[PDB]
Design a protein around this ligand. Structure first.
Ligand SMILES: [Mg+2]
Ligand SMILES: [Mg+2]
Ligand SMILES: [Zn+2]
Ligand SMILES: [Zn+2]
Ligand SMILES: [Zn+2]
Lengths: 266, 114, 196, 559, 141, 133, 168, 49, 43, 85, 159, 65
DNA sequence: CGATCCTCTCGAT
RNA sequence: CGAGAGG
């Protein structure tokens, strides 16, 4: 195109390795921040408990349920309940999951995020299905039942961002590095004898040219060219973590422009 | 127990406006916009972009206390240039930068495999 | 607290974004200060930390047992073979700006303890309430919506300042204050004042 | 004592304390719940009516609200219950028991209260979260820290009572103690550490940062100072932007060791019209020093101005540091391979010097120095050599510490750590003592059952050859443990001992005060001093000044 | 079998103890600089030998990683604090009816451990977690 | 306004006294045998070696507020390599008639020795140090 | 030489040679009489005591003795002209400033010095280190110090631990 | 994991604290301080086991 | 709990101090700060 | 009586810090209870700030009774006292 | 002992001297010895200085001794504070201890004395001696819940 | 006391990897280091999550209630 | 006859 | 009342 540039080194179902050229440091960082916190996802945020004759306490279980990853593909077509006109929740603003489990076997019975069942009318949107990546296809060990042990619960999953609770976090950790050779002197390597021998060289060093001692420091040089890697939890596919990241940022910049337009009258 | 609600970080309060544009007393053609329910995500980005404009004499943001989600933005420009127009342009450029990044990332992603 | 007489209470909580980060996306769970180190001379803290990093990476047990041949130098060797600088430092970036920090940070796991004594179990405030039977002074203890003791050491502080009107109300209005009828002849509270 | 000199009181609160880089010196962070508990009885006036009516409307649960409305005929109206808590029409003269609000003066305290400074008036800042928050530079007077200390708060109820607080106990009024005729509060920890780092000659900051720093100073005149470096890249120096925090007409001069007017070492201090000419800003300047920047700012610009200063200096330094970062690792205890040979070869000679005196003493060729036992002299010598040892080895370590050494950095700022610390962690722990003697023979003719009888060797009587970094041998371990215990015991002894001493001293002098004749007297009216302190001067307003007519040659005097 | 013996402080007075079976008595005739300086045998006439010098500590101090690298009082302080730390005091807490019980949601065994911890069931009933800790001057908070 | 002093100096010593970006240079005039100079310089932005012959200039030349270069239509009082701004803080009489001024460039110090500084270097908040080649 | 005294004369001077921007090149407009009598009259205004009687007036003259030594030393004709190059206008201000500062420097009647003094000894004592001492290097040079000595002193110990006589 | 070594007294679990004392039937000599007339003393607290 | 079950009360020449003889019998670290420092011991 | 005449008064013509503190408190207490103000509050609502203004403007009609240890006293008006501090 | 003393030329000079330190005291007899400067002889026992050279020398030594305890620590306290304690102790013509034996047995106020120590006993001898309480002390007003003649209340306000 | 869902530090879902971790150790007779690696727990914050986990739930389940 | 202040909790009669 | 405990 023309502005910031991309070079996707590695691409998987849960990881993007890329090079962000023609960008100011602020933008890369801001987009890193927004990926971490401001992207909407759907997570459990209400547990009605009918029976819990388990080892574990109601809220301990409830806590795990929020952390359980849920399909947030079509999340933009589900309202925040706070905006929904319904009294409480509904099919437009929420997804209802049910969990019934009883220790049938003598052997310890296990409870999985697969054992959760949607009851809500999904209205054809790719939403609320618990994220399974488990080879054996179970995904997340919620609880363990013994024998007479029963756990009957209902749960409403709502739209939210990691800023309100980390359970709505769509990404894991985000690798971020600029200037692998310290040509900018943006850091001061602590040493005993030799910085070069003592500090491990970066993977990204082969992506930039080495300094060359017979050259002075570059003063007009600026922070531009970033080696980022975005990891998904599985709520949203990797590309979307970065595309929705880019979007959500521009979305909230646009609101500022909009606010100036609004206060410009009365 | 004395902890505020987590939506207080992004949901606007009662009355509460997003931006408040106060005139700077200590300098001519300067202004202080208070952004309510915002952090270093917007703060840095806007300030950084303002510095790219050759008409912006001064630009800086600060978050007086971590507890509260709000930052102050001081902007001083040259004669015959409204800081509101400077902030407007700044935001506009930022969107166009992201607009490009969006299509660029997409273009690469579709050329990728796995 | 760490297992090294390094007790402290939380000051603030930052969310992942605002937190300092390693180029691999790692963020601290906790941030302790360089200052609470040289005075205390708790080297075992730093060793345990160095050791813990290697345990985590190697997928092994940290041998923090006393009289051993385990050395900072030997641990360092191991950690370096793992691809990190041997003395546990790491280049970190400012979560606000994204810029590298001029300093490298001693970063790694360390077994920390969640102790009793929690704010909300201690917070207490009283603006008038239950009074003792005998003395007619505020009751004792948080548990009973008690008053706080303005002891004699605090009495001394006020006298030092020369806050005489303030000292009086601390001892009369807040607390004890009462009215008696005295005889102008014998000067005793032996007056049967039939008010009304 | 329990019900009359001291007593349980109303309008009091307590909690865990926390520091706040973003709070004013004279401010105290009051948790929302506490502020909703404690009240002020405010008489209804036309100046306040509309505020008070709105507060009554907010009631007991919304923060700037109130509980209880008192009327003529002193009958209370409980706002959380009253069927008319909504209705309510305020009359002038009536009382509204409003919640404790922002800027109300309050008495903050930390026990043991053994100073006027352990109780000071503070401005209120109602805040989220359950801790009382306070400026780091008010830590020292209270002797507080954030490892779990709780602090007390008393709320004045009288108009004349809140005047007494703000006009006599206010934290700014309290900056310069009459105790030491110097400030009792200075720049500490991070801000002390950072100020050094920021202030170095090497430290240069660019436009981007400069502006955010400039904007961070509240007292800022909105004027960008001209960068020291104009040429390739306009660069500002740490000193330059920090001089923005410093007020005008602030003059400060020092001269440390090296110090020439060209200060090649960048030591001493020269501040003119409140701009730093040369010299690194560390403890000697920005601490609670006698001839410090604080002692000057208070005495020249005022307690209020000086109080705002702490704030700005912190605001800038804290910001710069947040973006620079500072840390401490195990590599900071690691001293050079060659230094390590030099250290062991040092302990080696100490070990021989002792063996030698041991061999000498044993041959009955030891001469006892008058007034002391032949054995006393031996022990005195051995001890000296071993102390000489630790010290040399430590100095060896200290020397080999690179300037980039984080420990060395705190030692330089004066923020944390002493030589002794560098010495023990890196070089050698040293001789252990109990009852002021080296480890004694607890067992018959031996310190431990792992030794032979009659063993006066460094090792036998408690000399720890090893550093904390190296580790301590079992024998060394136990001997250190014995010496450590002694400290712990006598700490517990002091706290109680000094506690009583203080009380008796107070009680003994309590009734003494200056009368309207500058005569210092007691409750009976007996003269202790005819002029207070022999000069009738207030201790806070005094400062060390050299008397020029006392020294130098009679020749130099006349000249 | 007479290989091990019980000795009290009074009898302890008449014996000579070796600290290690190895380093304390094999033979006589380079050195790792990193390792701590250990004094020469200079005693031969042993009657006994320690089981393990680390056994001089008891239950609380036995939880400390490297106490031989800490200043002696810090060791006393942590000996007091481990006692205030939360964890899983017993497996049957769900069944007991006691005033005040504090249980950690996700107890983790320490990454760095003492040999003694084994006999103390610390990695079986831990009281603490393995936080990722940064030593840094961050926000000043 | 206007230049206050100009001279070509030969570098005699270069000192990185426990500093990485700064160096203390010792100089003396090529024309004046009694003229001396001592200076702290940023060696990252302007590297200086032994026997270097630098051309030093002081001027009050080209209050208010610093506005960014904006070289769009800006022509500053230099064709020079290295430029600094400081304050005159001390004026010394080095016996007979020899004078010696002291300048601080935000901590980077200066000391010039001579005599002809007569109708020149005043106790001004002004002074821009200029160095070329 | 260095002793704690009210009024920093050094600062007042620096301030005057700033407030008045004096050029150390132009000769001062001061008289010997201006300096000599000026500095003499200033001494008469450094009131600590007020009463119109010799008994009190002597105590007054006594209370300021040391301060006036400093004043006279610092404001001697030679210095005021050669050292500080004070103009009549600048000098006059210095004199006013000293007088003003000196008066603010006086102790306030009502000042509860009893408690003050007690805490001022107490607090530092609480801070004191070691029950024994730091002296413990020499086998018998030891003298009771710190808290236990402070205890001996205050209790007026009839039988002290280390009685010593120092013979000149 | 419970170790025992304690008692249950009205549902409340009581620990007996091990009490340090000097052993009897022990002969000890003590130098008496300067003010006293007796220079030294041989002590024995004879008890029936 | 393990620590509590192994405590040592000492009532009332230098009983607070860590005596040589305590080697291998009493823990050199485990004792309360202040109050009953070194009077309360742990095996 | 006993007293001391206006002339022969030997105390500081200056107001003590405590003197100020009590005066300010006393007057702020009066203003707070709707007492008439002897100055024009330029948008001032706070009783203490008002008493502070009244002090600068020297519009407070309170006279200080300064007691001596023999019992005798000196009377000094707020008007006459110098307010340095 | 390294001693600073004026040079003929005026400058203060380090002219070292021989000094004798003692284990024990008998001031009375050691000063009357030849070869010793009796005008300079000192003792850490200020109570002996008192007995031999009077109460004013006592005051001086008692100060020197308090001062040293502060200074030994490395600390500094303004003269006036220790001067006042030293004065309080000394003003009775003797050495009034800061113990219930010294200052508390003093001719002060019954209520203010019992606030310290020997509470009941003080009050009984007060009743038996038929003592009059001035109500001028802090404690007395503190006890009576009255504004004490402390700073702010050390004067009276009128119209 | 169950494998936490998600790594406290980074947020990576670790709750699905427990059984699998125990199988790699027992069945595949692997060492912790390689086992953790095989489960793709690359950063030490994630390795500690599983490596340090004490699965008390099993002991609790042992009681009948 | 006194022997740091203050704080918290529990338990038992 | 006593025991434990916090700074
Ligand atoms: Mg400490
Ligand atoms: Mg503390
Ligand atoms: Zn809905
Ligand atoms: Zn009667
Ligand atoms: Zn992780």
């Amino acid at each position: 195109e023309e502005g910031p540039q991309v070079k996707i080194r590695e691409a998987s179902k849960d990881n993007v390795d890329f090079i962000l050229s023609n960008v100011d440091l602020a933008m890369a960082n801001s987009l890193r921040r927004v990926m971490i916190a401001e992207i909407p996802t759907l997570a459990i945020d209400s547990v009605e408990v009918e029976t819990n004759t388990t080892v574990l306490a109601d809220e301990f279980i409830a806590h795990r349920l929020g952390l359980i990853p849920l399909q947030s593909m079509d999340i933009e077509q589900l309202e925040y309940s706070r905006d929904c006109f319904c009294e409480d929740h509904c099919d437009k603003c929420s997804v209802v999951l049910t969990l019934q489990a009883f220790g049938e076997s003598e052997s310890t019975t296990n409870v999985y995020s697969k054992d959760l069942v949607i009851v809500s009318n999904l209205m054809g949107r790719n939403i609320g299905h618990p994220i399974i990546q488990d080879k054996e296809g179970n995904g997340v060990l919620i609880c363990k039942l013994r024998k007479g042990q029963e756990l009957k619960l209902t749960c409403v999953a709502k739209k939210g961002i990691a800023k309100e609770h980390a359970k709505w976090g769509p990404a894991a950790a985000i690798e971020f590095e600029y200037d692998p050779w310290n040509k900018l002197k943006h850091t001061d390597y602590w040493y005993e004898q030799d910085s070069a021998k003592e500090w491990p060289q970066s993977k990204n060093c082969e992506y930039e040219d080495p300094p060359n001692e017979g050259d002075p420091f570059d003063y007009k040089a600026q922070a531009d060219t970033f080696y980022m890697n975005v990891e998904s939890v599985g709520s949203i596919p990797v590309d979307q973590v970065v595309v929705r990241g880019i979007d959500t940022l521009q979305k909230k910049v646009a609101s500022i422009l909009l606010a100036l337009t609004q206060m410009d009258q009365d | 127990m004395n902890a505020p609600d987590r939506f207080e970080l992004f949901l606007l309060g009662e009355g509460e406006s997003k931006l408040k544009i106060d005139p700077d007393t200590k300098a001519p053609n300067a202004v202080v916009i208070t952004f309510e329910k915002e952090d270093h995500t917007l703060g840095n980005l806007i300030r950084a972009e303002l510095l790219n404009d050759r008409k912006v004499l001064f630009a800086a943001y600060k978050v007086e206390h971590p507890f509260f989600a709000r930052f102050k933005l001081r902007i001083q420009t040259t004669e015959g240039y409204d800081p509101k127009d400077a902030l407007k342009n700044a935001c506009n450029s930022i969107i166009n930068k992201l607009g490009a990044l969006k299509t660029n990332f997409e273009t690469e992603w579709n050329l990728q495999t796995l | 607290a760490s297992r090294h007489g390094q007790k402290g209470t939380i000051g603030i909580t930052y969310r992942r974004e605002d937190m300092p980060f390693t180029a691999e996306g790692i963020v601290p769970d906790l941030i302790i200060n360089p200052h609470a180190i040289p005075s205390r001379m708790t080297v075992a803290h730093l060793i345990e930390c160095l050791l813990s990093k290697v345990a985590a990476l190697s997928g092994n047990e940290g041998d923090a047992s006393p009289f051993t041949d385990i050395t900072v130098e030997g641990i360092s060797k191991l950690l370096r073979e793992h691809g990190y600088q041997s003395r546990g430092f790491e280049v970190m970036y400012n979560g606000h700006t994204g810029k590298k920090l001029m300093a490298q940070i001693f970063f790694g796991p360390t077994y920390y303890q969640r102790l009793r004594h929690m704010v909300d179990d201690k917070i207490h405030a009283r603006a008038r309430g239950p009074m003792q039977v005998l003395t007619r002074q505020p009751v004792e203890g948080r548990s009973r919506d008690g008053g706080l003791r303005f002891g004699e050491m605090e009495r001394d502080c006020m006298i030092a300042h020369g806050a005489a009107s303030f000292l009086k109300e601390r001892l009369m209005e807040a607390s004890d204050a009462f009215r008696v009828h005295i005889c102008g002849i014998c000067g005793l509270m032996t007056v049967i004042a039939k008010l009304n | 004592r329990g019900n009359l000199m001291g007593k349980r009181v109303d309008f009091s609160a307590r909690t865990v304390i926390s520091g706040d880089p973003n709070l004013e010196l004279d401010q105290v962070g009051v948790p929302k719940s506490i502020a909703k508990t404690l009240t002020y009885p405010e008489v209804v006036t036309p100046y306040n009516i509309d505020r008070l009516t709105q507060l009554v409307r907010n009631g007991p649960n919304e923060h700037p609200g109130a509980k209880y409305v008192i009327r003529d005929s002193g009958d209370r109206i409980d706002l959380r219950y009253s069927k008319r808590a909504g209705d309510i029409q305020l009359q002038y003269g009536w009382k509204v028991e409003r919640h404790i609000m922002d800027n109300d003066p309050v008495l903050f305290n930390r026990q043991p209260s053994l100073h006027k400074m352990s109780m000071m008036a503070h401005r209120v800042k109602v805040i989220p979260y359950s801790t009382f928050r306070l400026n780091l530079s008010v830590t020292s007077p209270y002797n507080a820290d954030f490892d779990g200390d709780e602090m007390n708060l008393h709320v004045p109820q009288s108009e004349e009572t809140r005047a007494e607080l703000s006009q006599l106990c206010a934290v700014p009024l309290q900056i310069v103690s009459p105790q030491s005729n110097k400030p009792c509060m200075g720049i500490v920890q991070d801000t002390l550490c950072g100020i050094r780092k920021l202030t170095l000659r090497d430290t240069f900051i660019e436009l981007d940062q400069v502006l955010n720093m400039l904007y961070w100073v509240p007292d800022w005149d909105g004027v960008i100072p001209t960068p020291a470096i104009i040429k390739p890249k306009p660069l500002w120096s740490g000193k330059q932007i920090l001089s923005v925090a410093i007020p005008n007409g602030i003059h400060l001069q020092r001269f440390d060791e090296g110090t020439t007017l060209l200060s090649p070492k960048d030591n001493g201090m020269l501040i003119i019209d409140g701009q730093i000419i040369f010299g690194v800003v560390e403890k000697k300047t920005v601490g609670s020093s006698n001839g410090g920047l604080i002692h000057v700012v208070t005495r020249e610009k005022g307690p209020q101005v000086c109080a705002k200063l702490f704030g700005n200096i912190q605001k800038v330094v804290n910001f710069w540091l947040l973006h620079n970062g500072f840390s401490t690792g195990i590599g900071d205890t690691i001293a050079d391979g060659p230094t390590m040979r030099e250290i062991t070869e040092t302990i080696a000679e100490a070990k021989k010097k002792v063996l030698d005196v041991t061999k000498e003493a044993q041959a009955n060729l030891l001469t006892a120095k008058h007034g002391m036992t032949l054995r006393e002299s031996f022990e005195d010598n051995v001890v000296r050599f071993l102390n000489e040892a630790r010290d040399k080895a430590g100095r060896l370590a200290e020397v080999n510490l690179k300037d980039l050494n984080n420990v060395k950095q705190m030692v330089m700022a004066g923020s944390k750590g002493s030589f002794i610390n560098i010495a023990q962690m890196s070089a050698c722990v040293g001789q252990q003592s109990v009852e002021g003697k080296r480890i004694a023979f607890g067992f018959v003719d031996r310190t431990l059952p792992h030794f032979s009888k009659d063993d006066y060797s460094p090792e036998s009587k408690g000399f720890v050859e090893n550093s904390y970094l190296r580790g301590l041998t079992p024998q060394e371990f136990f001997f250190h443990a014995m010496g450590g215990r002694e400290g712990l015991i006598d700490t517990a002894v002091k706290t109680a001992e000094t506690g009583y001493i203080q009380r008796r001293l107070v009680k003994a002098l309590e009734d003494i005060m200056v009368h309207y004749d500058n005569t210092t007297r007691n409750s009976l009216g007996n003269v202790i001093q005819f002029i207070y302190g022999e000069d009738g001067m207030d201790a806070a307003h005094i400062e060390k000044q050299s008397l020029d007519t006392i020294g130098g040659s009679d020749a130099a005097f006349e000249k | 079998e007479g290989l091990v013996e019980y000795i009290d402080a009074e009898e302890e007075e008449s014996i000579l103890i070796a600290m290690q079976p190895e380093d304390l008595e094999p033979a006589e005739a380079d050195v790792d600089p990193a390792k701590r300086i250990r004094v020469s045998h200079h005693a031969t006439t042993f009657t006994h030998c320690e089981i393990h010098p680390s056994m001089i500590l008891g239950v609380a101090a036995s939880i400390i990683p490297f106490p031989d690298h800490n200043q002696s009082p810090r060791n006393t302080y942590q000996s007091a604090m481990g006692k205030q730390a939360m964890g899983v005091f017993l497996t049957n807490y769900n069944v007991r009816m006691d005033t005040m019980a504090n249980i950690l949601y996700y107890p983790q065994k320490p990454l760095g451990t003492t040999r003694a911890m084994e006999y103390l069931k610390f990695r079986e009933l831990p009281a603490g977690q393995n936080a990722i800790v940064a030593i840094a001057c961050y926000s000043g908070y | 306004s206007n230049t206050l002093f100009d001279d070509i100096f030969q570098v005699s010593e270069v000192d990185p006294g426990r500093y990485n970006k700064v160096c203390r240079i010792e100089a003396a005039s090529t024309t004046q045998d009694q003229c001396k100079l001592t200076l702290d310089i940023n060696v990252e932005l302007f590297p200086v070696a032994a026997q270097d012959s630098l051309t030093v200039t002081i001027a009050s030349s080209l209050t208010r507020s610093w506005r960014p270069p904006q070289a769009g239509d800006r022509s500053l009082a230099d064709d020079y390599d290295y430029v600094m701004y400081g304050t005159a803080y001390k004026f010394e009489e080095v016996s007979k008639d020899l004078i010696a001024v002291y300048y601080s460039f935000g901590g980077l110090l200066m000391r010039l020795e001579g005599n002809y500084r007569n109708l020149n270097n005043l106790k001004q908040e002004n002074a821009y140090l200029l160095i070329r080649r | 030489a260095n002793w704690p005294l009210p009024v920093n004369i050094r600062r007042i001077i620096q301030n005057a040679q700033q407030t008045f921007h004096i050029d150390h090149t132009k000769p001062s407009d001061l008289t010997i009489k201006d300096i000599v009598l000026g500095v003499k009259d200033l001494q008469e205004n450094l009131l600590v005591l007020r009463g119109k009687n010799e008994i009190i007036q002597n105590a007054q003259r006594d209370a300021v003795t040391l301060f006036c030594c400093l004043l006279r030393s610092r404001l001697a004709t030679r210095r005021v002209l050669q050292e500080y190059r004070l103009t009549k206008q600048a000098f006059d201000w210095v004199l006013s400033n000293i007088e003003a500062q000196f008066l603010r420097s006086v102790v306030h009647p009502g000042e509860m010095v009893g408690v003050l003094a007690a805490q001022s000894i107490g607090e530092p004592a609480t801070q004191m280190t070691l029950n024994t001492f730091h002296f413990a290097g020499v086998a018998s040079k030891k003298v009771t110090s710190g808290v236990p000595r402070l205890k001996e002193i205050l209790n007026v110990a009839k039988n002290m631990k280390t009685p010593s006589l120092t013979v000149y | 994991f419970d170790m025992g070594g304690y008692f249950i007294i009205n549902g409340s679990e009581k620990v007996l604290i091990a009490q340090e004392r000097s052993a009897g039937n022990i002969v000890q000599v003590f130098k008496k301080a300067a003010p006293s007339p007796i220079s030294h003393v041989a002590e024995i607290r004879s008890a029936l086991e | 709990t393990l620590s509590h079950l192994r405590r040592t009360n000492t009532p009332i020449a230098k009983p607070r101090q860590l005596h040589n003889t305590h080697w291998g019998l009493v823990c050199p670290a485990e004792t309360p700060e202040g109050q009953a420092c070194g009077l309360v011991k742990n095996l | 009586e006993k007293a001391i005449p206006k002339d022969q008064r030997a105390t500081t013509p200056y107001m003590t810090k405590y003197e100020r503190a009590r005066i300010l408190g006393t007057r702020a207490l009066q203003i707070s209870m709707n007492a008439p103000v002897f100055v024009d509050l330029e948008g001032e609502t706070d009783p203490l700030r008002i008493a502070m203004k009244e002090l600068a403007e020297k519009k407070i009609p309170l006279v200080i009774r300064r007691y001596l240890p023999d019992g005798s006293f000196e009377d000094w008006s707020v008007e006459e006292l110098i307010v340095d501090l | 002992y390294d001693r600073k003393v004026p040079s003929p030329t005026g400058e203060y000079v380090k002219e070292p001297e021989w000094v004798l330190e003692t284990d024990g005291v008998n001031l009375s007899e050691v000063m009357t010895v030849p070869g010793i400067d009796p005008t300079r002889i000192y003792t850490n026992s200020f109570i002996d200085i008192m007995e031999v050279l009077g109460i004013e020398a006592g005051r001086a030594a008692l100060y020197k001794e308090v001062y040293n305890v502060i200074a030994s620590d490395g600390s500094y306290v303004n003269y006036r504070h220790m001067a006042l304690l030293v004065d309080v102790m000394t003003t009775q013509g003797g050495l009034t201890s800061v113990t219930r034996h010294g200052f508390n047995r003093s001719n002060t106020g019954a209520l203010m004395r019992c606030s310290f120590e020997e509470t009941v006993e003080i009050l009984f001898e007060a009743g038996a001696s038929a003592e009059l309480d001035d109500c001028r002390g802090v404690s007395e007003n503190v006890i009576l819940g009255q504004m004490a003649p402390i700073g702010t209340g050390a004067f009276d306000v009128m119209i | 006391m169950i494998v936490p869902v998600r790594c406290f530090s980074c947020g990576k879902v670790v709750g699905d990897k427990w059984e699998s971790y125990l199988n790699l150790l027992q069945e595949d007779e692997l060492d912790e280091g390689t086992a953790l690696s095989r489960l793709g727990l690359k950063r030490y914050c994630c390795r500690r999550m599983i490596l340090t986990h004490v699965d008390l739930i099993e002991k609790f389940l042992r009681y009948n209630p």
